[PDB]
Amino acid sequence: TRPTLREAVARLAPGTGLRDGLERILRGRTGALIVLGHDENVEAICDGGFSLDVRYAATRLRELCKMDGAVVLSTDGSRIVRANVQLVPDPSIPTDESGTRHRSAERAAIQTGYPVISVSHSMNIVTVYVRGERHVLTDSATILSRANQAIATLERYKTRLDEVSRQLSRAEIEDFVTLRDVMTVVQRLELVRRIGLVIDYDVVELGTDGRQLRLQLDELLGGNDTARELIVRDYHANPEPPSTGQINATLDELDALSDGDLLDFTALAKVFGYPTTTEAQDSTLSPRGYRAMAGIPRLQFAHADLLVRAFGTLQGLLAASAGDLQSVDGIGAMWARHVREGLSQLAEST
Amino acid sequence: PTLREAVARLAPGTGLRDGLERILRGRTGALIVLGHDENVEAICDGGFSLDVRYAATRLRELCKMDGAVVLSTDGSRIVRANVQLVPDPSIPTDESGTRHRSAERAAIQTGYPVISVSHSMNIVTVYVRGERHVLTDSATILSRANQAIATLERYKTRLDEVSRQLSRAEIEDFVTLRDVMTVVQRLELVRRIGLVIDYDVVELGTDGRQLRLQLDELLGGNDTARELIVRDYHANPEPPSTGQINATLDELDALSDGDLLDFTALAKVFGYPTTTEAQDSTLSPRGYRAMAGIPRLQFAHADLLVRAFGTLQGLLAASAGDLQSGIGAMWARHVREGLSQLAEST
Amino acid sequence: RPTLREAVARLAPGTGLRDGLERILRGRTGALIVLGHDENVEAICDGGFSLDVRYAATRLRELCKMDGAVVLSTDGSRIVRANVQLVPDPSIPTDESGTRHRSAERAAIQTGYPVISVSHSMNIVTVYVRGERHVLTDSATILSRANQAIATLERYKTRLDEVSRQLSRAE
Ligand SMILES: Nc1ncnc2c1ncn2[C@@H]1O[C@@H]2COP(=O)(O)O[C@H]3[C@@H](O)[C@H](n4cnc5c(N)ncnc54)O[C@@H]3COP(=O)(O)O[C@H]2[C@H]1O
Ligand SMILES: Nc1ncnc2c1ncn2[C@@H]1O[C@@H]2COP(=O)(O)O[C@H]3[C@@H](O)[C@H](n4cnc5c(N)ncnc54)O[C@@H]3COP(=O)(O)O[C@H]2[C@H]1O
Ligand SMILES: [Br-]
Ligand SMILES: [Br-]
Ligand SMILES: [Br-]
């Protein structure tokens, strides 16, 4: 049940007691070497030092780290057990680290199974070792600059997504949609998602410092998963409306594609089920109407799903009379007038 | 004084903050008492007695000497310097270090604020009645507040879209509970993000006045909108009193950020069922919002008409003479034209 | 209650304590040490850390890198506490300067035990014993003083030989 690397980095994320202590250590320029566990195996490699039983605090961690040596914490992290200790792990344990402190850190994490942090006195750099794996913490200021650059590109990817999405809707009304038109929106939908994943990683590392960025990212992305779901159900090559499993499977195959493959429209076609040939890109497609219904304001997907499965195509849905929509079981009178008005208003703009 | 009130006294643009920034560049550290009275003199040891006007330069130089500087309550004078604070050790504190424990303990006993600039951490911390706030560089606060202003602009764009949808549905007489809870949710988010940006602006002092201008435009009109949405769609059949409206708005503020998401929780506050079927149910607005949109309409006049006709769909349908039936006919002609113009624009 | 002159002997070169203080001086850390532990001293001590370790010169330096004061047992064979904040009664009067040194003398007066204070800014060791104050002097300076006296003793020895020879002849 030893902790994983990703689990350990969370323990050092902003807003935690450990991270508060490490920030004090960094401002003190003392350097440090911390062991996040204590048992018989850890004590076997711990030399001399001091044996103390004190409650953990960020200030207490800094003061004990003013002394040369290593501080050891209990497994639960609630107590500081030892300070000034000399770690003496088995030298046979391999490590490609530099310096006595950092090489001792990796060897110690490997032998005991617990994480070990090493703050460089000369470089003010925090590094955590867990089972031969290494992750370097980054100051929240640098991460925020990375995420704000990505937010700028995400805003532009949303602007281009909106322009090509509007173009596809206009083509759906005129019934001259091509596969190239759909795969143009598919590419932009995925690019928005991928930049979103980049920013999400930056948000997690920011801990409490990323709460403000969490709001900005969730609003800009918001509705992207709905859009990717709607384009798949509207334009999947399989004639019958896709099952809930089939939609998720197609979206997963899209995520599996490389960044270089997203630029290839033919690769995007394979995921939907169309041929990879250049002639297929020019081919006409007939939308089912899922996207058009979603455009209608205040229309829940449950209502639109019955109508799209019933009428089959966006052109039986458009030509429908308000009474025809009502016949479908589960569609109320009032909703039939609202949908018939919605499709008519879509025809006026385009 | 409250903690946040004290932060304004240490905020950029004030004399104290100028002095504290001087102290930070010197790496001297400091320990300052923001008050002087008979009780404070009892805990001040030795030191020097001086009567000079406060200045940023005077505060830095006096803080080069080990010990503490004491200022008068109004901050216009420096009373003593180099003092060794000796507060009662019985006073408990969860601080670490001799300087900082003396700061928190001293603030508690005297009742005045006590600032402590750490030499080892180059960090300013102010204590007020057992409370702790660490000053933050204006650059970090500005980045937080500008992301929040961007998010607030985006929240206003969504607020306008869902707000237009509700009014247009009011004309069409097909309002659902979900339509109302969408506007209620979006209104609260503008409120809460606005309060966050407000605190950052206060801490920013003179650097945040420009953000205050941007913030005051984005918020403006939010309090009126929350009041009117409660009047039109409160579950109690009788039009809610001002006391009931304010109680509903307070209960909204009491909800957590997670509850503002859940539409069913918002329904509970208004008095509707928490079930999903209730969210789909049709609701009929009272018409207070529509009448308020009509120019030159008194709230008392619109309140009489709303109590009589009940809904926005009896106000529209009512003939001009029906509105006068007791109300001034001249106003009745103005109400029918105003209601018709709203239907044409939507 | 050892006397002040007795305390200086405990801090004289060649002792364990003096080895630790010389480490502290080379480190420029400063320190505040209490050479005794009883129930009354603990009454004046705050949080800090509680350790039961044998004294060593190296061990004393590292604990004195942390802010606060370290407390030793009466005989000095064990170290009881580190990072402690002694808070003696401010009523005890002293015209000392700085929070550490005035706190040092007040602590020695109240407890009756010696308390050493090494100044970070001046690299000066001062010991307080029952309201008395003595500043230690580096062995280099004392040796220069004592060699001046040895020169005067040799010249006084020659002068003694001349007057003694003069007296014997007169006898
Ligand atoms: N076996 C060895 N082989 C080669 N060189 C050796 C060595 N042992 C020590 N040194 C050298 O001595 C420097 C200072 O050692 P010190 O223990 O004073 O200062 C140490 C000690 O406070 C701590 N540290 C390093 N390894 C440690 C360990 N295994 N356990 C506890 N603390 C450790 O990190 C400090 C800085 O280490 P850094 O490597 O930068 O600097 C080291 C390194 O250059
Ligand atoms: N009663 C006591 N018990 C244990 N250790 C004691 C002590 N009094 C002083 N020290 C130790 O001496 C250090 C230096 O004190 P100094 O007087 O040079 O310089 C002091 C002094 O100018 C100021 N300071 C702390 N407490 C104060 C107080 N109550 N009144 C005025 N100034 C205070 O903060 C400076 C740095 O304090 P810091 O804690 O960083 O570091 C302290 C602490 O390690
Ligand atoms: Br290093
Ligand atoms: Br400090
Ligand atoms: Br000093």
PDB file of N, CA and C in Angstrom, chain C residues 2-4 6-12 15-18 21 32-38 41 55 60 69-80 86 104 107-108 111-117 126-129 136:
ATOM      1  N   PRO C   2      26.292  27.175  41.910  1.00  0.00           N
ATOM      2  CA  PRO C   2      27.718  27.454  41.701  1.00  0.00           C
ATOM      3  C   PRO C   2      27.977  28.949  41.604  1.00  0.00           C
ATOM      4  N   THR C   3      29.191  29.346  41.979  1.00  0.00           N
ATOM      5  CA  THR C   3      29.573  30.743  41.878  1.00  0.00           C
ATOM      6  C   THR C   3      29.935  31.094  40.435  1.00  0.00           C
ATOM      7  N   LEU C   4      30.015  32.399  40.171  1.00  0.00           N
ATOM      8  CA  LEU C   4      30.351  32.864  38.829  1.00  0.00           C
ATOM      9  C   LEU C   4      31.727  32.360  38.410  1.00  0.00           C
ATOM     10  N   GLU C   6      33.263  29.781  39.408  1.00  0.00           N
ATOM     11  CA  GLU C   6      33.152  28.350  39.143  1.00  0.00           C
ATOM     12  C   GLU C   6      32.573  28.091  37.758  1.00  0.00           C
ATOM     13  N   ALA C   7      31.591  28.898  37.346  1.00  0.00           N
ATOM     14  CA  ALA C   7      30.975  28.702  36.038  1.00  0.00           C
ATOM     15  C   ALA C   7      31.977  28.919  34.913  1.00  0.00           C
ATOM     16  N   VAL C   8      32.821  29.947  35.029  1.00  0.00           N
ATOM     17  CA  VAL C   8      33.799  30.214  33.980  1.00  0.00           C
ATOM     18  C   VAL C   8      34.718  29.016  33.789  1.00  0.00           C
ATOM     19  N   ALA C   9      35.015  28.289  34.871  1.00  0.00           N
ATOM     20  CA  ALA C   9      35.827  27.082  34.754  1.00  0.00           C
ATOM     21  C   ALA C   9      35.114  26.011  33.935  1.00  0.00           C
ATOM     22  N   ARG C  10      33.792  25.902  34.086  1.00  0.00           N
ATOM     23  CA  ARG C  10      33.042  24.929  33.300  1.00  0.00           C
ATOM     24  C   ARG C  10      33.069  25.269  31.815  1.00  0.00           C
ATOM     25  N   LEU C  11      33.231  26.549  31.481  1.00  0.00           N
ATOM     26  CA  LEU C  11      33.305  27.009  30.103  1.00  0.00           C
ATOM     27  C   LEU C  11      34.737  27.217  29.625  1.00  0.00           C
ATOM     28  N   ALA C  12      35.733  26.816  30.409  1.00  0.00           N
ATOM     29  CA  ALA C  12      37.115  27.069  30.033  1.00  0.00           C
ATOM     30  C   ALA C  12      37.547  26.122  28.920  1.00  0.00           C
ATOM     31  N   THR C  15      37.051  21.870  27.905  1.00  0.00           N
ATOM     32  CA  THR C  15      35.817  21.273  28.386  1.00  0.00           C
ATOM     33  C   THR C  15      34.866  21.035  27.220  1.00  0.00           C
ATOM     34  N   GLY C  16      33.908  20.135  27.437  1.00  0.00           N
ATOM     35  CA  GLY C  16      32.918  19.875  26.409  1.00  0.00           C
ATOM     36  C   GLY C  16      32.094  21.101  26.071  1.00  0.00           C
ATOM     37  N   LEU C  17      31.657  21.838  27.097  1.00  0.00           N
ATOM     38  CA  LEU C  17      30.850  23.032  26.867  1.00  0.00           C
ATOM     39  C   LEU C  17      31.595  24.037  26.000  1.00  0.00           C
ATOM     40  N   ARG C  18      32.856  24.314  26.339  1.00  0.00           N
ATOM     41  CA  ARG C  18      33.614  25.317  25.598  1.00  0.00           C
ATOM     42  C   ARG C  18      33.841  24.880  24.159  1.00  0.00           C
ATOM     43  N   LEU C  21      30.708  25.899  22.437  1.00  0.00           N
ATOM     44  CA  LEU C  21      30.605  27.342  22.252  1.00  0.00           C
ATOM     45  C   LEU C  21      31.546  27.834  21.161  1.00  0.00           C
ATOM     46  N   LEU C  32      21.467  30.706  22.930  1.00  0.00           N
ATOM     47  CA  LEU C  32      20.966  31.046  24.259  1.00  0.00           C
ATOM     48  C   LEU C  32      20.777  29.727  24.996  1.00  0.00           C
ATOM     49  N   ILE C  33      21.661  29.444  25.949  1.00  0.00           N
ATOM     50  CA  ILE C  33      21.761  28.132  26.575  1.00  0.00           C
ATOM     51  C   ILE C  33      21.534  28.281  28.071  1.00  0.00           C
ATOM     52  N   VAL C  34      20.819  27.325  28.655  1.00  0.00           N
ATOM     53  CA  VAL C  34      20.567  27.283  30.092  1.00  0.00           C
ATOM     54  C   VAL C  34      21.297  26.068  30.646  1.00  0.00           C
ATOM     55  N   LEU C  35      22.203  26.300  31.597  1.00  0.00           N
ATOM     56  CA  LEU C  35      23.051  25.248  32.146  1.00  0.00           C
ATOM     57  C   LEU C  35      22.392  24.511  33.308  1.00  0.00           C
ATOM     58  N   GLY C  36      21.064  24.480  33.352  1.00  0.00           N
ATOM     59  CA  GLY C  36      20.365  23.764  34.401  1.00  0.00           C
ATOM     60  C   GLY C  36      18.951  23.442  33.985  1.00  0.00           C
ATOM     61  N   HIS C  37      18.398  22.386  34.581  1.00  0.00           N
ATOM     62  CA  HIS C  37      17.008  22.020  34.347  1.00  0.00           C
ATOM     63  C   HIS C  37      16.375  21.563  35.652  1.00  0.00           C
ATOM     64  N   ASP C  38      15.262  22.197  36.012  1.00  0.00           N
ATOM     65  CA  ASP C  38      14.470  21.800  37.168  1.00  0.00           C
ATOM     66  C   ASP C  38      13.013  22.143  36.868  1.00  0.00           C
ATOM     67  N   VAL C  41      12.455  26.124  36.130  1.00  0.00           N
ATOM     68  CA  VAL C  41      12.863  26.611  34.815  1.00  0.00           C
ATOM     69  C   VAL C  41      11.841  26.206  33.759  1.00  0.00           C
ATOM     70  N   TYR C  55      25.112  15.019  25.579  1.00  0.00           N
ATOM     71  CA  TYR C  55      25.721  16.238  25.066  1.00  0.00           C
ATOM     72  C   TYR C  55      26.885  15.905  24.139  1.00  0.00           C
ATOM     73  N   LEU C  60      25.538  20.383  20.073  1.00  0.00           N
ATOM     74  CA  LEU C  60      25.115  21.685  20.582  1.00  0.00           C
ATOM     75  C   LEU C  60      25.037  22.715  19.463  1.00  0.00           C
ATOM     76  N   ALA C  69      16.271  28.833  22.439  1.00  0.00           N
ATOM     77  CA  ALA C  69      17.257  28.484  23.451  1.00  0.00           C
ATOM     78  C   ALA C  69      17.245  26.978  23.670  1.00  0.00           C
ATOM     79  N   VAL C  70      18.424  26.408  23.918  1.00  0.00           N
ATOM     80  CA  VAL C  70      18.559  25.006  24.303  1.00  0.00           C
ATOM     81  C   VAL C  70      18.792  24.928  25.809  1.00  0.00           C
ATOM     82  N   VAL C  71      18.140  23.965  26.456  1.00  0.00           N
ATOM     83  CA  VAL C  71      18.268  23.736  27.890  1.00  0.00           C
ATOM     84  C   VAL C  71      19.041  22.442  28.104  1.00  0.00           C
ATOM     85  N   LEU C  72      20.050  22.494  28.972  1.00  0.00           N
ATOM     86  CA  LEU C  72      20.844  21.342  29.371  1.00  0.00           C
ATOM     87  C   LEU C  72      20.536  20.960  30.815  1.00  0.00           C
ATOM     88  N   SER C  73      20.886  19.724  31.160  1.00  0.00           N
ATOM     89  CA  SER C  73      20.789  19.271  32.537  1.00  0.00           C
ATOM     90  C   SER C  73      21.779  20.045  33.408  1.00  0.00           C
ATOM     91  N   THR C  74      21.605  19.918  34.725  1.00  0.00           N
ATOM     92  CA  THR C  74      22.426  20.686  35.656  1.00  0.00           C
ATOM     93  C   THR C  74      23.910  20.392  35.468  1.00  0.00           C
ATOM     94  N   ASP C  75      24.282  19.110  35.405  1.00  0.00           N
ATOM     95  CA  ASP C  75      25.682  18.756  35.204  1.00  0.00           C
ATOM     96  C   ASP C  75      26.157  18.991  33.774  1.00  0.00           C
ATOM     97  N   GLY C  76      25.250  19.261  32.838  1.00  0.00           N
ATOM     98  CA  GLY C  76      25.639  19.459  31.459  1.00  0.00           C
ATOM     99  C   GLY C  76      25.899  18.192  30.680  1.00  0.00           C
ATOM    100  N   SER C  77      25.585  17.024  31.244  1.00  0.00           N
ATOM    101  CA  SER C  77      25.847  15.767  30.556  1.00  0.00           C
ATOM    102  C   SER C  77      24.773  15.419  29.529  1.00  0.00           C
ATOM    103  N   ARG C  78      23.583  16.009  29.632  1.00  0.00           N
ATOM    104  CA  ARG C  78      22.474  15.721  28.733  1.00  0.00           C
ATOM    105  C   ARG C  78      21.860  17.038  28.280  1.00  0.00           C
ATOM    106  N   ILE C  79      21.266  17.025  27.091  1.00  0.00           N
ATOM    107  CA  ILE C  79      20.522  18.162  26.560  1.00  0.00           C
ATOM    108  C   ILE C  79      19.034  17.834  26.617  1.00  0.00           C
ATOM    109  N   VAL C  80      18.267  18.694  27.287  1.00  0.00           N
ATOM    110  CA  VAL C  80      16.852  18.438  27.555  1.00  0.00           C
ATOM    111  C   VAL C  80      15.944  19.028  26.482  1.00  0.00           C
ATOM    112  N   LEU C  86      12.258  30.857  26.320  1.00  0.00           N
ATOM    113  CA  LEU C  86      12.176  31.207  27.731  1.00  0.00           C
ATOM    114  C   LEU C  86      11.503  32.568  27.873  1.00  0.00           C
ATOM    115  N   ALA C 104      18.214  36.616  28.905  1.00  0.00           N
ATOM    116  CA  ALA C 104      19.206  35.692  29.445  1.00  0.00           C
ATOM    117  C   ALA C 104      19.460  35.967  30.921  1.00  0.00           C
ATOM    118  N   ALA C 107      16.591  35.097  33.120  1.00  0.00           N
ATOM    119  CA  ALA C 107      16.436  33.659  33.305  1.00  0.00           C
ATOM    120  C   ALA C 107      17.437  33.119  34.321  1.00  0.00           C
ATOM    121  N   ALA C 108      18.682  33.598  34.276  1.00  0.00           N
ATOM    122  CA  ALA C 108      19.681  33.150  35.243  1.00  0.00           C
ATOM    123  C   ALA C 108      19.312  33.575  36.658  1.00  0.00           C
ATOM    124  N   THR C 111      16.157  31.329  37.907  1.00  0.00           N
ATOM    125  CA  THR C 111      16.412  29.904  38.069  1.00  0.00           C
ATOM    126  C   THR C 111      17.588  29.606  38.985  1.00  0.00           C
ATOM    127  N   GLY C 112      18.535  30.533  39.108  1.00  0.00           N
ATOM    128  CA  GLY C 112      19.738  30.298  39.874  1.00  0.00           C
ATOM    129  C   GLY C 112      20.825  29.562  39.127  1.00  0.00           C
ATOM    130  N   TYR C 113      20.576  29.159  37.888  1.00  0.00           N
ATOM    131  CA  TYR C 113      21.531  28.432  37.073  1.00  0.00           C
ATOM    132  C   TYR C 113      22.220  29.375  36.102  1.00  0.00           C
ATOM    133  N   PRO C 114      23.390  29.003  35.588  1.00  0.00           N
ATOM    134  CA  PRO C 114      24.028  29.836  34.565  1.00  0.00           C
ATOM    135  C   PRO C 114      23.238  29.798  33.267  1.00  0.00           C
ATOM    136  N   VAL C 115      23.322  30.888  32.506  1.00  0.00           N
ATOM    137  CA  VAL C 115      22.732  30.954  31.172  1.00  0.00           C
ATOM    138  C   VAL C 115      23.709  31.690  30.263  1.00  0.00           C
ATOM    139  N   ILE C 116      24.107  31.044  29.178  1.00  0.00           N
ATOM    140  CA  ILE C 116      25.059  31.599  28.226  1.00  0.00           C
ATOM    141  C   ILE C 116      24.282  32.244  27.090  1.00  0.00           C
ATOM    142  N   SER C 117      24.794  33.362  26.581  1.00  0.00           N
ATOM    143  CA  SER C 117      24.207  34.031  25.428  1.00  0.00           C
ATOM    144  C   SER C 117      25.327  34.418  24.477  1.00  0.00           C
ATOM    145  N   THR C 126      28.639  35.563  26.683  1.00  0.00           N
ATOM    146  CA  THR C 126      28.418  36.157  27.994  1.00  0.00           C
ATOM    147  C   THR C 126      27.637  35.168  28.842  1.00  0.00           C
ATOM    148  N   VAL C 127      28.071  34.975  30.083  1.00  0.00           N
ATOM    149  CA  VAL C 127      27.439  34.039  31.002  1.00  0.00           C
ATOM    150  C   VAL C 127      26.901  34.813  32.195  1.00  0.00           C
ATOM    151  N   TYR C 128      25.671  34.500  32.589  1.00  0.00           N
ATOM    152  CA  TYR C 128      25.009  35.126  33.725  1.00  0.00           C
ATOM    153  C   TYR C 128      24.795  34.064  34.794  1.00  0.00           C
ATOM    154  N   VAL C 129      25.156  34.387  36.035  1.00  0.00           N
ATOM    155  CA  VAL C 129      25.049  33.458  37.157  1.00  0.00           C
ATOM    156  C   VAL C 129      24.539  34.233  38.365  1.00  0.00           C
ATOM    157  N   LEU C 136      33.268  35.892  28.577  1.00  0.00           N
ATOM    158  CA  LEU C 136      34.406  35.048  28.249  1.00  0.00           C
ATOM    159  C   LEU C 136      35.316  35.764  27.257  1.00  0.00           C
TER     160      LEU C 136
END
